[PDB]
Structure formats: structure tokens, C-alpha cells
């Protein structure tokens, strides 16, 4: 904002991290039902953590409810709470499920279409 | 090949030669040779360079 002697650490990670695979196809949120996903997110993380962390839950929710989310930024922000590779796998697992739900006509992922 | 500035830091002889050749071509380009360019029309209105002009001039004809 006012300082020059510090670098943008986000951009630095934007260069120097190892990211997930589905993180390219931009995604909109109008086309999505979330309240179907929400329990999936909850159980996913709660297992990753062995306990429940409401704040991480709501963090992911709030980062998603935007018009179009940045998968890069989201993987970064979860890298702290989860163990880094867990974040890569988790995001590259949810984001394709997002693509599925969004090309679905009801907006729901094919996993819960089947189940 | 004259020990001039252009060949400093060149050490291999084949390189010095080749470079000297292209530099010969360069200076030849920028030089002005009247003998080859200066174009002369004869009394018959067609063009020669001044070389042939003076040639056939004193050669009894031009």
C-alpha cells in the first residue's frame, strides 16, 4: 500500500507452489446448488482433520459463495489448515465435482445424481 | 590483414580471414568508384560508364 521494500508473497507462491490439475476451467456459481455439496465438504474436511472445525468449514463456504472463485487462492488459503498436499488433493477433488454439478441441468453433482 | 580495431579479440585465422572478406565487401560498398557507376551517354544517346566512354573515345570513335 505504502511500502516498496516488501514483496507480494501471494504472487511469489503463485509462481512457486505445486498446484492441482482441474484448476483451469473457470467456474460460475449461479449454475450451482451448494446445500447439496455442503455435507460433502463437511465430512471431507472433518475426516481430513479427525475432528470438526466449523471455522474451516465456513471459510471454504465463504470463499466459494463468490460469483467466480479463484481455485489458486483457495488452495493457498487451505494450505495452512490442511497439510498442503491434502489441500491439493481436496481442491482438485471438489473443483471437478463443481464442473460436474454445473454442467448438470439441476446444478447438482453426478455423484449425488447416482446416490 | 591490417592489425586494426575490428579484428581485436579474434584469434582463429580462418575467422580473421572470413571477417576480413566481409569487411572488404563493406568498405567496397560504401566507397565511391566513378569507373563503375558514373554513367555516360554517347552521342548516340545510349549509356556507357566513363571507363568505356574514354576507352572508345580515344579509341578513334567516341
Amino acid at each position: 500500500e505504502q511500502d516498496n521494500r516488501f514483496s507480494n508473497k501471494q504472487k511469489k507462491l503463485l509462481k512457486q507452489l505445486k498446484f492441482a490439475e482441474c484448476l483451469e476451467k473457470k467456474v460460475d456459481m449461479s449454475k450451482v446448488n451448494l446445500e447439496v455439496i455442503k455435507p460433502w465438504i463437511t465430512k471431507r474436511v472433518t475426516e481430513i482433520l479427525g475432528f470438526e472445525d466449523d471455522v474451516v468449514i465456513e471459510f471454504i463456504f465463504n470463499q466459494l459463495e463468490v460469483k467466480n472463485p479463484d481455485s489458486k487462492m483457495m488452495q493457498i488459503n487451505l494450505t495452512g489448515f490442511l497439510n498442503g498436499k491434502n489441500a491439493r488433493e481436496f481442491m482438485g477433488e471438489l473443483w471437478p465435482l463443481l464442473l460436474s454439478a454445473q454442467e448438470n441441468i439441476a446444478g447438482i453433482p453426478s455423484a449425488f445424481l447416482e446416490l | 590483414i591490417p592489425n586494426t580495431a575490428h579484428f581485436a579479440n579474434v584469434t582463429q585465422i580462418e575467422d580473421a580471414v572470413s571477417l576480413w572478406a566481409k569487411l572488404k565487401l563493406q568498405k567496397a560498398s560504401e566507397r565511391w568508384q566513378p569507373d563503375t557507376e558514373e554513367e555516360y551517354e554517347d552521342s548516340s544517346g545510349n549509356v556507357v560508364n566513363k571507363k568505356t566512354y574514354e576507352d572508345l573515345k580515344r579509341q578513334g570513335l567516341l
Binding site: - | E30, W32, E38, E39, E41, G45, V47
Partner: protein, 531 residues
């Protein structure tokens, strides 16, 4: 009050119980006769001494302007239904009702139309006739225009339908003047050019040559080669297949015409091809210099084609202009600068002997004397460049001895024509430039450190107490590209008169003078060089 004398002079004054302050000019050594006449919303005075000189305040501005007609004898105002306002003017064996038109003016115009953009013109000195080249990108030469108009009518006929419906005749007979509907012209590499010999008295066009479809005319010169007699020839450089923004050409030609019928009709002699657009031609000691791209060749007149008598290959970029004082040649190219060049006559050489220290997109030049050049810039600047006193005229980063730049000024608009000349009779020399937005200005030398210093102080104090209107800084403006050097702003100095007299007196007190003397000293300079 106004007092005109009999050896043509007249002085104006205020009147209060004492004649306040005087001003004086001259109007031919013959009696200044005076006549009150109503003019354009004002009373004004005529004067006749040897020329009709109307004296009047234009929105409180005393301009004393000639008007253009023969000598006069007497006059006075006049009105009628036939003439809402005019002048009864009796002159040699005549009485005339005259009318004075547009009064807000310094020059008055008369326009002779043309067909395309005129890129250059030259005066033939005997018959006083203007040879004019004209060129237009992305156009159609006239022949081609009519031909392919015809051809599209050919297509249109073929609609196979009622045959009966013939818009052909209507099409080919309808002729929408381009002067009002625009030129029906397009293409991207398509040029269209023309030559025209015109008389300057009235717009009668003594002759008109029409070049082919993509032959574009870029330079013209009128000269006498010495190997023939007093035969005046006319040379016209012409590019062929030019493309503009990528750049490329097919190549140039130099058309030669004999300029016969005492100077009112061209006649083609020969076109000698050349390897790039000949953007500059100059007569030079009985032969002709020609810039061709980067090469600078000296040609002489051969009677099948032009002959290459000399050449230089060192000019930097692309020759845009060529001038010659008696034996020096100032080449001026498109991005570096002016380049001086010496013609070693007997040894037959063109040797570069000085150049410039700055990069500068010249668009025009003019020699002030043997040692000095003045140049304009594609960006708005004007410079004056001089050769240092001890230059070695004849010898035998990249140059030898450089030239010092002794003035620099940002005019504001591209200046495309400079010329050193005198305007009023008897008045002193000045350097007149004409911009590309329609402006005309002059630059005038100072003759006395006292003058120069008075004016330096006037403008220095105006800069501070009467700043530019829209926010800018005057010094920063005039130093837009290179900082100012040895020029003063008459346009800013002459805003004293429109300042508010409290401020007038503050400035004239910084000078320790009065607004009247300050204003008189503002206008004497204006008067001894220009209008």
C-alpha cells in the same frame, strides 16, 4: 485625436486638456487625408496617402490596415437600400460605391481549387507560374475511377431481370461532385497524383498532367541544366507502389518535362527509373542533386535518361530534404538531423564534414546564412543550428566535427514551412513559419541588449503573476521536448494589454514604468518587423 502629415506619417493621441501621449507611423510620402466613416459597428477613420489605410480599434485594438486597390482621391461614408453600408470613393476619373467585408482579419484570402492534397509547389521565375504536385493515398486516379465505374455498371446490367430496368444510363450520367460528397476512393496501397501549372493571378490552370494509377508524386524542382541553353526543365520524383505502415516500394522514377510555351505547358521527355522514392530534388551548379532513399546522387542531363555523375552513400537514414548555399549542401534526414556536406568540384566528391549532436525528426529547413540552419520538427519544435567558427570546410559517435544548437523553441503545432524574408516595405528581415493547424508566426531578432533585457523581464514577470489559463507552466510548455534557448514569447508578452490594470501597474512598477510606455515598447517590435 489623429494628425496626418503630408510626407506620409500620422500620429494618434488621446485628448484631455493636454495632448496626452503620441504614437506615430508612416503611411508613400504624400498627404494623409482623413475621413470619418461608420464601419462594422464602429466609427473609424479612413486615411489616404498613397494607399487606402483604414485606422480602427478592433475590440479596442488599434490596427491600421491597408486595403488592396489602386490610388485614391477622396471618399466618405455612404448608405442606401442597395448599400446598407459602404464608401462613396472618388478616385482617378471614377466615383465608386465600395463595400468593406470581413473586418476581423489580418490577411484576406482568395482560393483557387485543386484536386488532391498539394504536397509541394515551385515558382517558375520568368512567367511567375506555380508548378504544383498533388498526391493522395488510398485514392483512384481519374481514368481508373471512370473506367471501373463503367465496369460496375457492366456488372449491374447482368441481373437477368426486366433488361427493361436500366440504371446504367442513370448511373453513368449521375456525377456527385467529390468536393461535397467526398472522394469515391479507397484501396490501401493505391495512390493518385497529378501535376499542375497554374497562374497566380487568377486560378486558370495553364496545364495539368496526370500520372498513372500508383505513381505518387513527392518532389518537384524547376531548374536549368547548363549543358543545354536557357531551356527550363521540370523534374518530378515519383514513387511506385508505395506502402505506408509496413514500408515498401516497387521503386522510383524522375520524370523530366521541358516546360515549353514560355512557361505554360509541360512536355514529357523521359522517365529514368531509380531504386527508391526520390524524396528530395535540388538544383545545384548546373546539375541536380537527388536524394534517393539513403543515397545522395548528383545527376546531369542525359537526353535518353538522367546520368549519375556522383553519389554519396553515408547519409544515415532516409534523405528528406536538400538545400544548398553556394557550394555547401545541407542534407536533412528523417530521424537524425541536418548533415552538412561539401562538394569538392574538380575531384568530384561529396564529403560529409559536420553533423549534429541530437536526434530530431526534421520536416523542413531553411538556411539563415553560410554557417546557420533553422529547422522544424515533426513534434512541434523549431531549432537553429550553427557551425562553430573554426570549422574545416574542406577535408579528406559517428562524425568528425559537430554543430552547436543555438536556439530551441516549442511552437506547439507541427511547423511545415519556414522562410526568411521581409513583410513590410523597408522593414527588417524576419523568419516566418506556418504551422499545420493554420497558424502563421514570425521570429524576429533582437538588436540591443537593452531591448532583449526589457522583454526578458516582461515575460519573466508575466509568467509569475499571470499564469497560463488551463493549468500548465509556461516554461515547461515551451521546454516540452528540449529546454528553451534564446527565444521570448510574444504571445505571452502581448497579454499585458489584456491584464487588469492593477496588475498592469504592479508589473510596470517592477519595471519602474507605466502601462503606456510598456505597451508602446510592446508594439514597436511588432511594427518594425511585421503588422
Amino acid at each position: 485625436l489623429n494628425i496626418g502629415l503630408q510626407n506620409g506619417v500620422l500620429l494618434r493621441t488621446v485628448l484631455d486638456p493636454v495632448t496626452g501621449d503620441l504614437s506615430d507611423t508612416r503611411t508613400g510620402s504624400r498627404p494623409v487625408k482623413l475621413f470619418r466613416v461608420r464601419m462594422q459597428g464602429q466609427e473609424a477613420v479612413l486615411a489616404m496617402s498613397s494607399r487606402s489605410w483604414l485606422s480602427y480599434s478592433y475590440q479596442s485594438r488599434f490596427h491600421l490596415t491597408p486595403l488592396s486597390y489602386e490610388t485614391l482621391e477622396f471618399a466618405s461614408g455612404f448608405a442606401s437600400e442597395q448599400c446598407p453600408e459602404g464608401i462613396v470613393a472618388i478616385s482617378t476619373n471614377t466615383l465608386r460605391i465600395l463595400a468593406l467585408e470581413k473586418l476581423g482579419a489580418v490577411f484576406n484570402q482568395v482560393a483557387f481549387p485543386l484536386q488532391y492534397t498539394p504536397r509541394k509547389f515551385v515558382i517558375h521565375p520568368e512567367s511567375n507560374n506555380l508548378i504544383i504536385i498533388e498526391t493522395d493515398h488510398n485514392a483512384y486516379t481519374e481514368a481508373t475511377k471512370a473506367q471501373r465505374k463503367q465496369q460496375m455498371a457492366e456488372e449491374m446490367v447482368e441481373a437477368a431481370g426486366e433488361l427493361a430496368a436500366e440504371m446504367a444510363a442513370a448511373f453513368l450520367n449521375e456525377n456527385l461532385p467529390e468536393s461535397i460528397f467526398g472522394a469515391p476512393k479507397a484501396g490501401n496501397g493505391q495512390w493518385a497524383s497529378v501535376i499542375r501549372v497554374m497562374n497566380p493571378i487568377q486560378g486558370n490552370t495553364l496545364d495539368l498532367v496526370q500520372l498513372e494509377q500508383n505513381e505518387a508524386a513527392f518532389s518537384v524542382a524547376v531548374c536549368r541544366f547548363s549543358n543545354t541553353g536557357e531551356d527550363w526543365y521540370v523534374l518530378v520524383g515519383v514513387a511506385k507502389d508505395l506502402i505506408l505502415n509496413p514500408r515498401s516500394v516497387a521503386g522510383g522514377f524522375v520524370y523530366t518535362y521541358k516546360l515549353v510555351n514560355n512557361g505554360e505547358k509541360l512536355e514529357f521527355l523521359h522517365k529514368t527509373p531509380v531504386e527508391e522514392v526520390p524524396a528530395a530534388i535540388a538544383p545545384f551548379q548546373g546539375r541536380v542533386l537527388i536524394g534517393v532513399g539513403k543515397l545522395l546522387r548528383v545527376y546531369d542531363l542525359g537526353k535518353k535518361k538522367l546520368l549519375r555523375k556522383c553519389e554519396n552513400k553515408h547519409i544515415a537514414n532516409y534523405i528528406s530534404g536538400i538545400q544548398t548555399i553556394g557550394h555547401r549542401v545541407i542534407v536533412s534526414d528523417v530521424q537524425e538531423s541536418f548533415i552538412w556536406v561539401r562538394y569538392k568540384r574538380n575531384e568530384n566528391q561529396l564529403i560529409i564534414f559536420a553533423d549534429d549532436t541530437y536526434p530530431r525528426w526534421v520536416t523542413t529547413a531553411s538556411l539563415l546564412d553560410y554557417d546557420t540552419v533553422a529547422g522544424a520538427d515533426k513534434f512541434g519544435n523549431i531549432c537553429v543550428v550553427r557551425l562553430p567558427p573554426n570549422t574545416n570546410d574542406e577535408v579528406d559517435n559517428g562524425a568528425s566535427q559537430k554543430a552547436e544548437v543555438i536556439m530551441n523553441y516549442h511552437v506547439g503545432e507541427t511547423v511545415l514551412s519556414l522562410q526568411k524574408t521581409t513583410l513590410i516595405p523597408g522593414g527588417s528581415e524576419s523568419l516566418v513559419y506556418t504551422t499545420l493547424s493554420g497558424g502563421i508566426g514570425i521570429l524576429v531578432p533582437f538588436t540591443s541588449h537593452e531591448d532583449h533585457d526589457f522583454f526578458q523581464h516582461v515575460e519573466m514577470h508575466l509568467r509569475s503573476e499571470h499564469p497560463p489559463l488551463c493549468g500548465r507552466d509556461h516554461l515547461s510548455f515551451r521546454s516540452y521536448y528540449f529546454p528553451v534557448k534564446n527565444v521570448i514569447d510574444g504571445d505571452l508578452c502581448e497579454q499585458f494589454n489584456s491584464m487588469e490594470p492593477n496588475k498592469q501597474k504592479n508589473v510596470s512598477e517592477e519595471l519602474d514604468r507605466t502601462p503606456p510606455e510598456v505597451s508602446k515598447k510592446l508594439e514597436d517590435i511588432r511594427t518594425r518587423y511585421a503588422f
